[PDB]
Every structure is written in C-alpha cells, then in structure tokens.
Write a protein that binds this DNA or RNA. Structure first.
Ligand SMILES: Cc1cn([C@H]2C[C@H](O)[C@@H](COP(=O)(O)OP(=O)(O)OP(=O)(O)O)O2)c(=O)[nH]c1=O
Ligand SMILES: [Ca+2]
Ligand SMILES: [Ca+2]
Ligand SMILES: [Ca+2]
Length: 342
DNA sequence: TTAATCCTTCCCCC
DNA sequence: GGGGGAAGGATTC
C-alpha cells in the first residue's frame, strides 16, 4: 500500500489565457510563438480542445493552423504569467502533502500513502483537489491515481481532459499485457521503433528478451525501467526536484554564418538568461546552435568558479567560433544554457 | 520571442 | 581494470 496521486493541468497555457480573459472560453484558442522570420512564422505551443478536435495542436506551424481555422483566436505566448499562475497552484498542492515532486510547469506527483488508506479515499481527495484548484485559480486539471508514479500518470492520460481516474492493481496487471508499449512514459517514437524490431509491442514482452540484448538497443536505465514495470516491481520515490539549468534560445531573422551578424542575438540570449538565473550563479556554460536543417549543435565549458556576465559574453563568442569551425552549415537559431549552480 | 536524464567517448591515473 | 569527470549527442516531455 503506497498510493500516488498525479496532477496535470489541461491545455495549460491556453487555459490561462481563458482565465485572464473569459470572453475566450468556448472558442478555438491557439497560443503561438511567432519566431518573426516572416508573416506568421513560428509554431504552436498549445491549443485548447475546441481547436484540437480539428487538427490544430502543439508543434504544427502557425501558417498551417490558419489554413485550418482562419478565425480561431491566435495569442502570443506569455511564459512569465503561466509560470506565476503555476507556482500558486503548486502551493495549493503542498497543502495536501509533504511529499511532492514537481515534474514540469504543469505536472506534479503527490505521495498520499499516509493521508489516505485506500483507493476510494484517494478518489475523494482527488475530486477535492480538483474542486479546490477550480475555485481558487479557476483551472481544470486531470488527476490520475495508482500504485506508482508511472501508472498514476498513465491513468491521467486516459482520463483527460478535466478528469479523474484510478488504476487499481487488477487493471495494472492487465495493462502490463494489453497497454501499448508506446503509451508508457519515457517511450518516444525512437524508443518505440527500436522495441518494434526486438518484437516488444507490450510491457510483458520485455521479459521474453535476454537482458543484454535490450541493454544494447535502448540503454541500461531504460531496460531496467521497463523490466521492473513488467515484473511490477517499479516503485520510485517522490523526491522534490530542483532546476538544474537555465537558458534561452532565439531565432535569427535570416540563417547566417557571419559572426558579427549572430553576436547580437547571442548576447540578447545571455541577458535574458541572467535575468532568469536571478541570484543563481552557474559554473557551466553551453552555447547552443540550431542549423538550417534543424539539427542541434552545441559546445560548452565548466569553470572552477561561477561565471560572471562579462565572462559569459566573452566565453560564448569563443564557443560560437568553435561551432562554426567544426560545423560548416548555416545557423538558424542561437542560444545559451547555464548550469551547475553554486 | 519558447528543461531533464541517459549514453557514448575520451582522457588521466591508480 | 575501473573510478571520475567533462564533453557532445540522443531522447522524451
Ligand atoms: C508540446 C509543447 C508544449 N509547450 C508547453 C505549453 C503547454 O501548455 C505545455 C505542454 O503541453 P502539455 O503540458 O503536456 O499538455 P497541455 O496541457 O498543454 O495539453 P493537454 O490538453 O494534454 O493537457 O507545455 C510548449 O511551449 N511547446 C510545445 O511544443
Ligand atoms: Ca498538461
Ligand atoms: Ca504535462
Ligand atoms: Ca509515446
């Protein structure tokens, strides 16, 4: 008996725009990031359900989304607001448990093995949490409930939007056989494809392969992960997480190779990155470059001390010269990433 | 206008 | 032979 409760906010960014302006609810709302290269360049960060049922979702080009819903409301993404609205909600969650793991800007795991004694009581603490968040911050969320972090999140995907579901041990047993391997957290397209070849379409299937052949295909961490889920031995603790890196990437108007033409962008990125750092001091710095064909290239350096703004400016141009040197393609997007704080 | 955890090398050295 | 760590890249959400 160890009951994990997972919370996930529905189409978060979009739902926040509906809160800050209710005249929006009911219509197709699409939050985008207008990269600025040309008219409507850029992608979609997220759309609400009214838009999603028509194909408009996160990842597609804004241009493509206007071909489908010329009259949907297109709003520019406001990262900062969403972040603060999230912090408030993350606090309402600490009112229910001491053991809370904040997965992303909208996902959180709460260990409530103690506060509750069985699934029934959980499902109640679930509706309770949903209703509290709805009245305090006006946001709908989906709640998953199960034995461990992995199934609690799977439950959530099955119950969204605005839902609540409990996956009990009998269902876990059948899911380890019926549930599609790809629907397992941490299994993207690439890992799903490698597993197709190894003849593993279901979780159970992993016990039919010799360990070392699975370790040579998808890595050891991933292998043990899938195997413990199959034998039903997975039981990761809910540890609190802490930012391990902050950075910013910007899109340049035109793809380039000229150093003096890229610097300006690179520098803007560093300014905004030190703003996000707020009091934090990084020892490591990484310059990140996105080539014209969308391949990511980067170069970094760890110092035995914190990096000051002057140092960042200076060190980044060097790493950028190290990038153009080793890479002969043109650069589409450029940015930096700081880490290893003091 | 958009962060995290492995994995694989490589190098230094006990 | 294996500890340690840094660097660049692969993958996922
Ligand atoms: C996928 C994606 C997400 N995001 C951000 C914005 C979203 O609100 C959030 C990511 O999507 P998700 O948080 O995983 O889910 P969503 O809440 O927006 O979708 P769902 O209806 O399933 O609840 O993270 C981006 O900025 N860009 C992207 O390409
Ligand atoms: Ca979500
Ligand atoms: Ca999410
Ligand atoms: Ca998947």
């Amino acid at each position: 008996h160890m009951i994990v409760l997972f919370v996930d906010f529905d189409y978060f960014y979009a739902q926040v725009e509906e809160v800050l302006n209710p005249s929006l609810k009911g219509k197709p709302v699409v939050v985008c990031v207008f990269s600025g290269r040309f008219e409507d360049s850029g992608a979609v960060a997220t759309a609400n359900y009214e838009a999603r049922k028509f194909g408009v979702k996160a990842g597609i080009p804004i241009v493509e989304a206007k071909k489908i819903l010329p009259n949907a409301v297109y709003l520019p993404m406001r990262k900062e607001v969403y972040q603060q609205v999230s912090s408030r909600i993350m606090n309402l969650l600490r009112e229910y448990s001491e053991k809370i793991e904040i997965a992303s800007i909208d996902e959180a795991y709460l260990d409530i093995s103690d506060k509750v004694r069985d699934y029934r009581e959980a499902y109640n603490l679930g509706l309770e949490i949903k209703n509290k968040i709805l009245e305090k911050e006006k946001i709908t969320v989906t709640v998953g409930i199960s034995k461990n972090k992995v199934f609690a999140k799977i439950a959530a995907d099955m119950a969204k939007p605005n839902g609540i579901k409990v996956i009990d041990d009998e269902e876990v047993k059948r899911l380890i056989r019926e549930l599609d391997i790809a629907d397992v957290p941490g299994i993207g397209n690439i890992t799903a494809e490698k597993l197709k070849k190894l003849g593993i379409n279901k979780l159970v299937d992993t016990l039919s392969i010799e360990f070392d052949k699975l370790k040579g295909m998808i890595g050891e961490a991933k292998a043990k992960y899938l195997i413990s889920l199959a034998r039903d031995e997975y039981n990761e603790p809910i540890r609190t997480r802490v930012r391990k890196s902050i950075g910013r990437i910007v899109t340049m108007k035109r793809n380039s190779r000229n150093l003096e033409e890229i610097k300006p962008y690179l520098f803007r990125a560093i300014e905004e990155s030190y703003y996000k750092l707020d009091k934090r001091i990084p020892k490591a710095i990484h310059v990140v470059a996105v080539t014209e064909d969308l391949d990511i290239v980067s170069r970094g350096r760890t110092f035995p001390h914190g990096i000051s703004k002057e140092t960042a400016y200076s060190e980044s141009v060097k790493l950028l010269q190290k990038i153009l040197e080793e890479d002969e393609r043109k650069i589409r997007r450029i940015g930096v990433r700081f880490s290893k704080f003091i």
